[PDB]
Amino acid sequence: VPNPTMPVKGAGTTLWVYKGSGDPYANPLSDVDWSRLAKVKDLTPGELTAESYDDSYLDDEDADWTATGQGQKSAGDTSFTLAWMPGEQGQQALLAWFNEGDTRAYKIRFPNGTVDVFRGWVSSIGKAVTAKEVITRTVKVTNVGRPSMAEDRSTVTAATGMTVTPASTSVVKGQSTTLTVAFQPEGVTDKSFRAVSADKTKATVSVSGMTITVNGVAAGKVNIPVVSGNGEFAAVAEITVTAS
Amino acid sequence: VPNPTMPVKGAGTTLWVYKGSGDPYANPLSDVDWSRLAKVKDLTPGELTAESYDDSYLDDEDADWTATGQGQKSAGDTSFTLAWMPGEQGQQALLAWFNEGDTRAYKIRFPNGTVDVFRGWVSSIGKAVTAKEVITRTVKVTNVGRPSMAEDRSTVTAATGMTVTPASTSVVKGQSTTLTVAFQPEGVTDKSFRAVSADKTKATVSVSGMTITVNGVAAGKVNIPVVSGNGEFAAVAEITVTAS
Amino acid sequence: VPNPTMPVKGAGTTLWVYKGSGDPYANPLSDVDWSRLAKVKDLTPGELTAESYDDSYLDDEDADWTATGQGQKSAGDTSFTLAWMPGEQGQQALLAWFNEGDTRAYKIRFPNGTVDVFRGWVSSIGKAVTAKEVITRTVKVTNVGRPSMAEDRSTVTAATGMTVTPASTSVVKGQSTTLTVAFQPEGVTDKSFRAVSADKTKATVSVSGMTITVNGVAAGKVNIPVVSGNGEFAAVAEITVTAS
């Protein structure tokens, strides 16, 4: 249904702020570590610009027509207003973003499956208060550096399938077993995953570089659920732990 | 019932000025040492803004784009127009506040149980005389220092109040079972989750209304993983589907 | 049928960008090495402008008025807003053209058989998101050098293809006689004429429908001179009017 080669109606556009660590430009399709800013009244994305450089000399024969070239670009000033909910995270995190000069990353997800991720700092925090109308919070973010347009991530293989094969063996205290995850639907993929223990007590799990290490902290039958990327697919594995 | 996590309609917003001698930011909720500015025609809260600081150098590898940082923050000016009642206290106090030019504190009480408290000096006093419409006094206050927004005194709770209890029964074709999630770490919670199946072939999942619904499309044993927040907590449910 | 000598309604104007390696001004009509920018919401062509140059001296006799001359010409900037299709070629090419900053050629094909060709660099890339309305990408291209207007490749013919044949008969009172003129020097000609009588008393003349008409108000021999263009060609007609 989402066709990036046909015009879209604009309804359903979504805003997120990178609350995690690492490279936000790498895999922006996944929603992991992206806090959503809900109840967006309106959004005006930033406009990439360019300054003009005067490229004229005295030796240049004739000067009837001006000659110019591209200069600095300076993407900036993405603004938006959303419903005012002072006690909800993402809006509190927004004021935290304003209160220091942090240059954080934020992404705009469009209804046609494309993402535009910018990176900037908050330069304006306003509020409009009128009767018989919901109080709105208005934000403006000055963008720094080169952004990541949706015209760059034009590959998208869509994945659609993974498997999780665990050891599923008893593990003695102090030893780490390795879980296997296959995320190769014909090889090329554009998604990540995270695994989190369902009890957090009998075992401790760690996912890094596709490597899943599970340690049998306490005896029992621990269940490790894994969810891929934003959460299109998931799986459940079991690991026994023996007291001996 | 005020709810800071839901949008509010702005009607009923009140304006107060500090006539006490303590710390205005200490207990803004209490209206003990505050004078209400009654009969406010309309209000426009001050807008927080920060200027841009150039953060570029001659030896910077890349210049094709501008590098900037957040500079000095300002609290703007709050402007409110209220009915002219010169004979009442509160307007004489406002006129004296403008007249002797001291930096006083004031606050805005929204229909949310929250309050935004600023500190500033009156930079404009105006009037509007016109027949058939009430005489309105318009005031502009330039804010100084750092404001104490309603996001400052909000509270977040992450006391591990996540629990999951499924139907834990045998579901049939054409009928969906329900799974309940408890999110009460002493009642107050601020975190959400995401629940999905493990294969999406034996059972189809749907999360709504603080609840999970599982449709037994195919017989067998199916696994439903749930992950809370950013992967701090998880749960695994087992659902058996029979032939009928 | 396109007709450059008659006004056109502007619907169907197409935008193209040069992806070849030849001379863009050589054969603009051929769309061989050109890629179309489809789904153009609206277009604003660049405006040619030239600044003023003060052409006055101290020893100038008269100075009650200002003497100025044409200075340096600029081609302005062409701004077009078109539907956002990030996944299609042509918009990715546009984004790369903005990003790497070279001066590329483009053209506008009017519903006239004519075409305007410009050379410039993209100085602005924008977007507009709003519900119930298509997402639009807005582009601004600053033009450089001398542009190639559609008037550059127009052709004029003055091959002396003027001929005049009257009815050369006897006209009566109350009846009007016709006279024909040929302007076909192999077909193409843009030079007009003017036809009138020599006394306007024996016969009254009227030119319309690319045809002369003579009303025989009075009997006798009357002379009708016709002059083509700026006096390069002429013809003389003799018309006899009888008593009846």
Beta strands per DSSP E along C91-175: 104-109, 115-130, 133-143, 162-165, 170-171
- Residues in Cβ contact with A100 at an 8 Å cutoff, skipping those fewer than 6 apart: B70
Compute the distance between CA of residue C9 and CA of residue C94 in angstroms, rounded to an integer.
28
Nearest-Cα distance to chain B for A27, in Å, is 17
Token pair of B185 as six digits: 């770490």
Compute the distance between CA of residue C28 and CA of residue C115 in angstroms, rounded to an integer.
7
Compute the distance between CA of residue A228 and CA of residue A30 in angstroms, rounded to an integer.
9
Contacts of C128 in chain A (CB under 8 A): 44
Nearest-Cα distance to chain B for A212, in Å, is 14
Rg (CA), chain C: 28
Compute the distance between CA of residue A224 and CA of residue A222 in angstroms, rounded to an integer.
7
Query: Given an 8 Å threshold on Cβ–Cβ distance, is B8 in contact with A135?
Result: yes
Nearest-Cα distance to chain A for C100, in Å, is 9
> By the 8 A CB rule, do C192 and C208 touch?
no
Query: Given an 8 Å threshold on Cβ–Cβ distance, is A223 in contact with B236?
Result: yes
Query: Given an 8 Å threshold on Cβ–Cβ distance, is A144 in contact with B223?
Result: no
Compute the distance between CA of residue C66 and CA of residue A86 in angstroms, rounded to an integer.
64
SS3 C97: helix
Query: Given an 8 Å threshold on Cβ–Cβ distance, is A50 in contact with C86?
Result: no
Strands A52-54 and A68-70: antiparallel
Question: In chain C, which residues touch A (CB < 8 A)?
Answer: 39, 72-75, 83-88, 91-92, 95-96, 98, 101, 103, 121-135, 138, 142, 144-146
SS3 C203: coil
Taking alpha carbons only, the member of C93, C80, C77 closest to residue C41 is C80
Strands C170-171 and C233-241: parallel
**Phi, psi (rounded to 5 degrees) for C57:** -135, 160
Query: Given an 8 Å threshold on Cβ–Cβ distance, is A225 in contact with B231?
Result: no
> By the 8 A CB rule, do C157 and C190 touch?
yes
Token pair of A42 as six digits: 């309106």
Taking the CA atoms of B222, B223, B226 and B231 in sequence, report the sign of the dihedral they define.
negative
Compute the distance between CA of residue B177 and CA of residue C232 in angstroms, rounded to an integer.
98
What is the signed CA dihedral for B127, B128, B134, B137, rounded to 10 degrees?
-20
Check residue C190 and give left, alpha or beta (phi > 0: left; psi -120 to 50: alpha). alpha
Size of interface A-C (CB pairs under 8 A): 110
Query: Given an 8 Å threshold on Cβ–Cβ distance, is B68 in contact with A142?
Result: yes
Resolution (A): 3.0
> By the 8 A CB rule, do C116 and C150 touch?
yes
Nearest-Cα distance to chain B for A105, in Å, is 14
Taking alpha carbons only, the member of A13, A12, A26, A50 closest to residue A190 is A26
Compute the distance between CA of residue C174 and CA of residue C244 in angstroms, rounded to an integer.
9
Taking alpha carbons only, the member of C73, C74, C89, C165 closest to residue C120 is C74
Token pair of B176 as six digits: 């969906």
The technique is cryo-EM
Contacts of B198 in chain A (CB under 8 A): 225, 234-236
Beta strands per DSSP E along chain C: 14-18, 34-36, 40-44, 49-54, 68-74, 77-83, 104-109, 115-130, 133-143, 162-165, 170-171, 176-183, 193-195, 204-208, 211-215, 220-228, 233-241
Contacts of A89 in chain B (CB under 8 A): 156, 190
Token pair of B18 as six digits: 């500090």
> By the 8 A CB rule, do A28 and A107 touch?
yes
Contacts of B154 in chain A (CB under 8 A): 86-87, 92
Hey, how many other C-beta atoms are within 10 angstroms of the C-beta on C6? 8
Nearest-Cα distance to chain A for C196, in Å, is 46
Query: Given an 8 Å threshold on Cβ–Cβ distance, is C129 in contact with A13?
Result: yes
Nearest-Cα distance to chain A for C83, in Å, is 6
- Following DSSP, what letter does each residue of chain A receive, concatenated? ---TTS----TT-EEEEE-S-S-TTT--SS-TTEEEE--EEEEE---EE--EEE---SSSS--SB--EEE-------EEEEEE--TTSTTTHHHHHHHHS---EEEEEE-TTS-EEEEEEEEEEEEEE--TTS--EEEEEEEE-S--B-TTT----------EEE-----B-TT-EEEEEEE--SSS-----EEE--SSSSS-EEEEETTEEEEE--SSEEEEEEEEETTTTEEEEEEEEE---
Of A6, A45, A48, the CB nearest to C98: A48
Query: Given an 8 Å threshold on Cβ–Cβ distance, is B66 in contact with A134?
Result: no
Cα atoms in the Cβ-side hemisphere of radius 13 Å centred on C10: 6
Neighbours of chain B (3+ CB pairs under 8 A): A
Compute the distance between CA of residue A83 and CA of residue C89 in angstroms, rounded to an integer.
37
SS3 C95: helix
Taking alpha carbons only, the member of A163, A229, A152, A226 closest to residue A190 is A229
Contacts of B194 in chain A (CB under 8 A): 227, 231
Query: Given an 8 Å threshold on Cβ–Cβ distance, is A196 in contact with B11?
Result: no
State the DSSP code for C136. Answer: E
Query: Given an 8 Å threshold on Cβ–Cβ distance, is C144 in contact with A49?
Result: no
- Residues in Cβ contact with A74 at an 8 Å cutoff, skipping those fewer than 6 apart: A49, A50, A51, B65, B66
Contacts of B197 in chain A (CB under 8 A): 234
Token pair of A187 as six digits: 């090889």
Closest chain B residue to the Cα of A91, Cα to Cα: B151
Compute the distance between CA of residue A6 and CA of residue C134 in angstroms, rounded to an integer.
10
Compute the distance between CA of residue B97 and CA of residue B89 in angstroms, rounded to an integer.
12
Taking alpha carbons only, the member of B68, B164, A110 closest to residue C129 is A110
Query: Given an 8 Å threshold on Cβ–Cβ distance, is C85 in contact with A5?
Result: yes
> By the 8 A CB rule, do C189 and C229 touch?
no
Contacts of A9 in chain C (CB under 8 A): 131-135
Compute the distance between CA of residue C44 and CA of residue C77 in angstroms, rounded to an integer.
9
